[PDB]
Design a protein around this ligand. Structure first.
Ligand SMILES: Cc1cc2nc3c(=O)[nH]c(=O)nc-3n(C[C@H](O)[C@H](O)[C@H](O)COP(=O)(O)O)c2cc1C
Ligand code: F3S
Lengths: 1472, 117
């Protein structure tokens, strides 16, 4: 996995470039997916220049005459099975090349060697050939390249015409060639011996290797591509393709001419994201622009409103963002035009990219700084690429442009500043709109009648509205969602309940939004779409709004500006139309929209303003979906905009789905009327109305940003009309016809059900005599409302059965709960066997069945210590497993009690916050667990209120007492699957006996993610559902996010069985498990272990108050008080009895069905049947996609291996074979070794042995020391304990000092290095992630996210990058240089010192929660002096030395940064 | 893959319901892959059945006619999107076809349905 590019600066071809590319490719085998075969790869490739002399000598030998101009050679993949496809494709190519007039020299068969390819990579091997075409018309290179591109496109279209399969063109150009395939990285020069020739010299080279998630290779899917190479994964492709489908209908350029016609469907079929991006990039380059300009236009910089850039770049970025939609996502790009060679990064800068210049005029860049061996006395400058940066090389003139120089040189081509001034805002338009035209308020009775027509209750106004108007933030709930799903419910559930939101597992990182909110934009532009292949002042003349949501006054002002060009359309249908009124209304509106747009209209306002007693309102979602889809399909969406006036928008989940469907702006007027009516009654106090409206809009925008950030999209323009939702319970026809791209794995109600529901509610509201709104139960139970899962009768009966310890009571409980009408998916299925029953005494004992149950994780921050300890003791008594969850654990509980009760936990979690993760915390468990996303709040981090943190929790988490602690949504260690494999390797090295468990959340596409994580040596997968509890999270994330585990579990099982991977991993599920029937159904689906969770809390005393976030739970389960903790009534015997009953129920059911063990029922899906609720509901749920049976073959249907999946050994092994005197006599040692980038986690296993022998703090500092010479790998010294000293001479790649636990790391350049130690990067990204103790001294600059989540470490580094010291918690950090933008964001504890010569810190710092001043206390001066003295002592630096020399005049150049919450708690005050 | 199945199901269901007939549901045919060789198994497709009933009360003659027209339209629409390995072995109210790439004598073992009474 990785990209790389080598370039000769002067611009002269030479062989060293090519071979060095090969050498760099030969050393990326550690990041790839290891396979037991040793021959099967997953894609590799190189991209070089054309060796003219080679092919010219070939032609000369053949018998022709070598021409004077350059040659053109095209590499093609033809089919291999039959002999017609080859001949047909050859005929097509030759007829299509000769139609222009060029001369064909002949075909050539590339020599290959199939001895190295595996099997599955050989069954689809295509026939590789080359065609040699020469230019005889004497045209220029420019026109020649143009016709070659046009010929390639025409050949592709013509071949696709005849539906010929497995045909591909890897290149057709006169400048560059591409050698790619499905082999291993190191075996590239063996499969293609041509590259071993002496005449293959070039002036640039790009190389790439990928890491696929499945095990079915397709040769045309290997990178690099033609004028592109991509590392990472793009988020927004379902929306960018849809917008390209509208951009195509107006674009044209005179360079192409009539031939423009065959490039209309630019993004074909059968491509990935890296293919569509490449196609768009190539089209935009071939029309006049240059590679830097296209890279800026597609992947722009983050437009931030600070004074740290010249206004030229701001105007340029404004133009670029105005002309095109960005292509977000983690992306490290290495692209090449015919002249330029560019290496660039995305907006957030997630992937790493490091480069190096040598004295030979040679630049080498890639993912790792140790790929190409280079003598240290040959370097000139080392560097990196920050967020949005780029580095370019011009081969024509032979020059090297860095970031700022390239920006300056690019900002002078066109007068951007004079062009951007054409933009018109609405803020000025609403300011100048005089305060007239105030409309009279609606009557109370009319408001109530309209609110009743949509099903709005008073709990929608007192619970989820009032906090918005008062606080400016959003509502909060604290328990799982036990509400029935939308289709099975019986009340009026709005259409916006059928759409679940989306998020990102390991393959993509979610974007946290409370800290780097500066890179997220909500800009909206009307009058924007047009020709994307132009450059003029008319392209930047439009209307710009700062938020897609508009109030009523802003809507009236914008309607003023629109005026005499807009067209309004009603969205109401007659109630008495008949059985097909809704469909006819849809038809009518989608015809009138097209007939009005063709008439010159430019703005469409879709409103339901005419709703009355005889006209029902069409659901706004359906209306805007139909209209947007029709406008896209008729090549008219490019002409107009789409404004919606709705009467149901009250929650932040409505606006999300409306903007996701395709609407431009959304106006919600009924909510504003309700706000005004509630204000006139004197309910908010003394605040004005405009302040309330501003607070409401701010809360809406914050919630919209939260919803947009769960997936990784940072701009609204690329999220609109992409539809990243998922419908559960809608008919396949309806979704596939009216909505752009959503999957409905089970069909649901069509149009008749929607019409019936709408008409029923309308009749109830407009014919019945309303006096007040119903109370309504959706978040809390009310007798008039809906049904729920956990309620009074069942809870009391369960507590009685568990307390009295009698089984018949528990059967009464199960009988009550298994008799309600269906509420979940697993209620419709039915067990049905064909064998004869067997007696009860013959099935497995309760012991071996109870050992299959575990308890999910519940942090100590949420639960009380007594309940946590009770669970840990109860689960260890029966031999099962418990869980500690996030928030760490008490060390003093690490020994068995003398009651015998073991308070330890057998499963430890590694959250994304790393709040208590140390070296001892990971060596005191049997089985580990990685938590990627939680069931209740997917794509989000756990929360903990500011008053829940006492001394005990603050000491247990190494944080500040009385401070809100919010975990980061992303992981900062897991940005892609290769990083997940790296982290799994780390975890398996630090603990040599435990297993690694990955926890996902059920959704669509989880099958490929599961097949990918199984190749990363993970051995247990956990699938949670949307029905899980939580400690504290917003209500929208609880009710409108996730999916039932019935879908995800079956999907993962089928996908894992299909890839021959099921026999290596285990499956575990939880969420909503209550009885034995549920457990038997889950075991039939494919699971092997089961988690219980909430039910256990009910056995201990919880009574479902749903006030866990208030710290006032009555019984005393989740509360951090003392007066309330004294009311606990839990005891382990209750939990033991619950588990015993639950297991013996499974025994009952198994004996009644006809089997004798759970191993004989797992996977046997054919024992389940589907029966529907009857002929009076007509929901067409077909669970057959859920009951499909994939045949395993020879393997079993469960895990059949012993122990964990094994891993190779790094250098540490040799160390353990050398430092035996240290472990047996306990004496000092000293070792020296040579490091290389193919060696990961150096010094971790040794730390494990030291921890097991002496402990974390048993050895004096510097007991064992190692001296590495070379380039260190990744995760160098991760989880190192005190007593170990690593000294690296060279550099470290990434994650150096991750989770330091008291050790000591020192990085310095070579003594013979001619480099300025304060101007060259020496360590990469994410340094000191979640460290608690130790020291780290570096003699260079660090990467991005330097010292994130630091807790006790001390670091001295000569530089930093962007987002440094983000969300730090404790320790000291000295930075002797410049910092990056958004420095010290979310910092809440510790201290920092910056050495400021530029006097430019107040421009970069995030002055939100920290204060910055100058040193005024000698006590804080001795600290800095001693730190710099220790730095000089260890690294022998020269910068810090001369800083220490001139101390009296440089002490006044330091800024001291201290958190705001550390102002009352420091030991001596910072002031005078 | 799991898209081609879903895409083809969506196409079939949108194209049958455009005429007005009622879909009763899908059914997965029971098979036994123990008898098939290797090269005859790497290209084995997913076999399914769709049950449609006539509710408009039309005659058999018009019913067969619309069934043929629906089959042709489904074929064209699926070919539109260049989806590979999609086939319809029969769609009629009169006859059914059980065929495959197995030996002649092993037909009743791969398809146990024909062993019914
Ligand atoms: C009070 C509470 C705290 C929780 N804390 C965590 C946690 O810290 N980490 C985590 O991964 N899941 C946490 N969970 C979710 C559980 O791990 C599990 O997914 C959930 O309880 C399953 O729901 P169920 O009991 O209905 O089956 C918590 C759940 C609750 C109710
Ligand atoms: S709902 Fe929460 S407040 Fe206590 S009683 Fe149950 S843990």
């Amino acid at each position: 996995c990785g990209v790389g590019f080598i370039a000769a600066i002067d611009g002269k071809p030479r062989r060293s470039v090519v071979e060095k590319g090969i050498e760099a490719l030969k050393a990326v085998w550690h990041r790839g997916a290891v396979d037991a075969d040793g021959k099967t790869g997953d894609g590799a490739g190189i991209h070089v220049a054309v060796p003219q002399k080679f092919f010219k000598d070939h032609v000369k030998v053949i018998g022709h005459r070598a021409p004077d101009n350059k040659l053109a050679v095209g590499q093609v993949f033809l089919p291999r099975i039959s002999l017609d496809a080859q001949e047909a494709c050859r005929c097509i190519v030759e007829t299509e090349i000769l139609a222009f007039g060029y001369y064909i020299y002949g075909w050539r068969q590339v020599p290959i060697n199939v001895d190295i390819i595996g099997e599955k990579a050989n069954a689809t091997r295509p026939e590789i050939e080359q065609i040699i075409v020469g230019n005889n018309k004497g045209v220029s290179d420019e026109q020649f390249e143009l016709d070659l591109y046009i010929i390639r496109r025409r050949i592709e279209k013509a071949v696709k015409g005849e539906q010929i399969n497995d045909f591909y063109i890897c290149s057709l150009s006169a400048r560059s060639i591409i050698y790619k395939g499905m082999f291993l990285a190191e075996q590239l020069t063996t499969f293609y011996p041509d590259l071993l020739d002496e005449r293959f010299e070039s002036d640039f080279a790009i190389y790439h290797q990928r890491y696929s998630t499945n095990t079915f290779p397709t040769w045309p899917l290997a990178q690099p591509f033609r004028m592109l190479a991509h590392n990472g994964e793009i988020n927004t492709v379902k929306g960018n393709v849809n917008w390209m489908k509208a951009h195509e209908t107006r674009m044209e350029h005179p360079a192409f001419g009539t031939h423009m016609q065959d490039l209309k469907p630019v993004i074909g079929v059968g491509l990935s994201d890296s293919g569509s991006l490449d196609t768009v990039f190539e089209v935009m380059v071939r029309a006049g622009r240059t590679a830097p300009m296209v890279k800026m236009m597609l992947v722009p910089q983050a437009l931030t409103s600070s004074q740290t850039t010249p206004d030229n770049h701001k105007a340029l970025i404004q133009y670029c963002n105005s002309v095109m939609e960005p292509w977000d996502g983690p992306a490290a790009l290495a692209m090449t035009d015919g002249r330029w060679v560019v290496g660039g990064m995305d907006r957030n800068g997630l992937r790493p990219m490091r480069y190096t210049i040598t004295t030979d005029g040679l630049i080498i860049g890639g993912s790792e700084t140790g790929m190409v061996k280079i003598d240290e006395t040959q370097v000139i400058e080392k560097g990196r690429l920050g967020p949005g940066e780029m580095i370019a090389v011009d081969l024509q003139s032979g020059k090297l442009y860095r970031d700022r120089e390239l920006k300056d040189h690019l900002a002078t081509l066109k007068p951007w500043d004079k062009w951007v001034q054409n933009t018109t805002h609405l803020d000025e338009l609403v300011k100048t709109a005089s305060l007239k035209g105030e409309p009279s308020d609606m009557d109370k009775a009319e408001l109530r009648r309209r609110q009743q027509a949509f099903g709005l209750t008073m709990e929608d106004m007192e619970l989820i509205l009032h906090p918005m108007v008062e606080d400016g933030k959003e509502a909060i709930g604290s328990m799982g969602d036990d509400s029935p799903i939308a289709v099975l419910s019986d009340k009026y559930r709005g259409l916006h309940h059928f759409f679940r939101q989306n998020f990102s597992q390991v393959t993509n990182p979610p974007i946290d939004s409370l800290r780097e909110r500066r890179v997220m934009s909500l800009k909206t532009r009307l009058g924007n779409l047009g020709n994307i292949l132009d450059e003029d002042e008319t392209q930047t003349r439009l209307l710009q709004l700062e938020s897609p949501v508009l109030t009523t006054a802003e809507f009236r002002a914008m309607r003023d500006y629109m005026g005499d060009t807009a067209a309004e359309i009603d969205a109401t249908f007659p109630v008495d139309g008949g059985p097909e009124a809704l469909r006819d209304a849809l038809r009518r509106i989608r015809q009138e929209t097209e007939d009005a747009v063709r008439g010159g209209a430019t703005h469409v306002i879709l409103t339901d303003e005419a709703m009355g007693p005889a006209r029902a309102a069409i659901p706004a979602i359906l209306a805007t979906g139909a209209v947007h889809t029709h406008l896209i399909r008729s090549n008219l969406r490019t002409f107009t905009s789409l404004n919606v006036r709705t009467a149901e928008g009250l929650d932040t989940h409505y606006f999300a789905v409306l903007i996701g469907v395709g609407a431009t702006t959304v106006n919600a007027y009924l909510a504003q009327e309700a706000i005004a009516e509630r204000h006139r009654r004197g309910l908010f106090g003394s605040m004005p109305l405009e302040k309330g409206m501003a607070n409401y809009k701010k809360a809406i925008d914050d919630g919209l940003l939260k919803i947009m950030s769960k997936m990784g999209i940072s701009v609204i323009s690329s999220y609109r009309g992409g539809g990243n939702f998922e419908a559960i319970g809608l008919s396949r026809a309806l979704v596939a016809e009216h909505f752009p791209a959503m999957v409905s794995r089970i069909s649901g109600i069509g149009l008749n059900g929607i019409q019936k529901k709408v008409l029923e509610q309308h009749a109830t509201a407009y014919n019945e005599e309303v006096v007040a709104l119903p109370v309504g139960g959706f978040y809390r139970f009310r007798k008039s409302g809906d049904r729920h899962g956990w309620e009074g009768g069942v809870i009391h009966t369960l507590q009685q059965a568990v307390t009295n310890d009698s089984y018949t009571t528990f059967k009464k409980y199960s009988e009550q709960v298994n008799k309600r009408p269906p509420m979940q998916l697993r209620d419709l299925l039915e067990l049905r066997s064909t064998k004869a029953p067997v007696p009860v005494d013959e099935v497995e004992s309760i012991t071996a069945i109870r050992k299959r149950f575990i308890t999910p994780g519940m942090s100590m921050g949420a639960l009380s210590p007594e309940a946590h300890g009770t669970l840990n003791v109860a689960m260890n008594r029966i031999g099962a497993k418990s869980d500690s969850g996030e928030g760490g654990e008490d060390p003093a509980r690490f020994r068995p009690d003398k009651n015998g009760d073991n308070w330890n936990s057998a499963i430890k979690q590694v959250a994304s916050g790393r709040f208590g993760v140390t070296a001892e915390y990971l060596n005191q468990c049997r089985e580990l667990e990685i938590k990627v996303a939680q069931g209740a709040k997917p794509g989000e981090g756990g929360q903990l209120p500011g008053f829940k943190v006492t001394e005990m929790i603050a000491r247990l988490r190494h944080s500040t007492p009385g401070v809100m602690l919010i975990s980061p949504p992303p992981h900062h260690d897991i940005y892609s699957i290769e990083d997940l494999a790296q982290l799994i390797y780390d975890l398996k090295q630090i603990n040599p006996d435990a297993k690694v468990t990955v926890k996902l959340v059920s959704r669509s596409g989880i099958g490929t993610i599961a097949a990918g994580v199984a190749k990363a040596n993970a051995d247990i997968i956990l699938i949670s559902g949307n029905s899980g509890g939580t400690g504290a999270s917003p209500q929208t994330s609880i009710k409108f996010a996730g999916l039932p585990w019935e879908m995800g579990l079956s999907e993962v099982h089928q996908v894992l069985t299909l890839n021959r991977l099921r026999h290596r991993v285990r499956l575990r599920t939880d969420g909503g498990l209550k009885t034995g029937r549920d457990i038997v159904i889950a075991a039939m689906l494919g699971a092997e272990e089961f988690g219980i969770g909430t039910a256990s809390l009910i056995a201990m005393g919880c009574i479902m108050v749903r006030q866990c976030h208030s710290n006032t739970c009555p019984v005393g389960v989740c509360v951090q008080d003392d007066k309330l903790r004294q009311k606990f009534v839990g005891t382990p015997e209750k939990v033991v009895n619950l588990f015993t009953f639950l297991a013996e129920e499974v025994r009952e059911i198994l004996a009644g069905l006809g089997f004798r063990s759970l191993n004989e029922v797992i996977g046997r899906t054919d024992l389940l049947h589907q029966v529907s609720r009857g002929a009076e509901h007509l929901d067409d749920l077909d669970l057959n996609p859920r009951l499909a049976q994939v045949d395993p073959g020879e393997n079993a249907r469960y895990c059949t291996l012993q122990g964990r999946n094994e891993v190779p050994d790094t250098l540490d092994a040799r160390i353990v074979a050398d430092a035996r005197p240290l472990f047996e006599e306990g004496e000092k040692m000293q070792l020296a070794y040579n490091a290389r980038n193919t060696q990961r986690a150096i010094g971790t296993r040794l730390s494990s042995m030291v921890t097991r022998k002496f402990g974390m703090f048993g050895l004096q500092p510097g007991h064992i020391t190692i001296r590495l010479r070379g380039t260190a790998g990744q995760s160098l010294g991760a989880f190192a304990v005190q007593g170990i000293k690593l000294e690296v001479m060279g550099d470290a790649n990434d994650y150096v000092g991750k989770g330091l636990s008291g050790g000591t790391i020192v990085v310095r350049p070579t003594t013979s290095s001619p480099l300025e130690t304060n101007k060259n990067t020496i360590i990469g990204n994410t340094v000191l992630y979640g460290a608690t103790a130790g020291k780290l001294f570096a003699a260079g600059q660090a990467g991005e996210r330097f010292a994130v989540r630091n807790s006790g470490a001390t670091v001295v580094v000569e530089g930093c990058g962007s987002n440094g010291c983000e969300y730090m918690t404790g320790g000291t950090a000295v930075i002797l240089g410049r910092v990056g933008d958004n420095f010290a964001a979310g910092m809440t504890g510790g201290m920092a010192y910056v050495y400021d010569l530029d006097d430019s810190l107040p421009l970069y710092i995030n002055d939100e929660s920290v204060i910055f001043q100058r040193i005024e206390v000698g006590h804080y001066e001795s600290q800095l002096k001693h730190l710099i003295e220790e730095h000089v002592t260890e690294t022998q630096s020269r910068f810090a030395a001369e800083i220490l020399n001139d101390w009296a005049r440089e002490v006044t150049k330091f800024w001291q940064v201290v958190p705001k919450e550390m102002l009352n708690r420091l030991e001596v005050p910072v002031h005078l």
